Amino acid sequence: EKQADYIDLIPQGGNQFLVNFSVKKTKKDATHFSIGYNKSFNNLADKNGFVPLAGEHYSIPVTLDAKILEKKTKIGITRKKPEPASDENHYTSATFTIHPNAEPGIWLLRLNKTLRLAKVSGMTPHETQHALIHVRNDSSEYELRR
């Protein structure tokens, strides 16, 4: 809303997911923070003895189904206020939608770039994408330069 974080689902595979996030304001209160699901249920992972920090990438796995993911599933995160917390903190969320076999093109130009660059540089196609740096506002000129 003003700023909390970005929250990203990264599917590991069948029924295996991962949540990357980087919360901005990390000053107030967190004791064993929670992760919401469908906006009202399923504390997904309450196992952290750690308070996340400002501007830092994190990662935490969760196993779900793709069937609820086919619908809009409102996944939230809950930095736990110490004795009471369900949604009474600085709370944020996101929903997430999957639908297969749609818009094939916009991924494939990145595959084009890394395959041309992998055949050219002599490096393997894994290690070329492994040696590319991606920021959301990073121009591909600067990525080529790097």
Binding site: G13, G14, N15, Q16
Partner: protein, 49 residues
Amino acid sequence: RDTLNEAKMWYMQALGLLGDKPVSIFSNGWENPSLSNAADKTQAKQFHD
């Protein structure tokens, strides 16, 4: 030299017998199961059933 071209035509005949090299899948429906979950007695009963 001519015997090296002989060698190439023999190995190309052998590749013609074998055909297309089977690409081993790695992205798969294989989840990573629990060893308790992987060794269930029902999991072999249902299979042989």
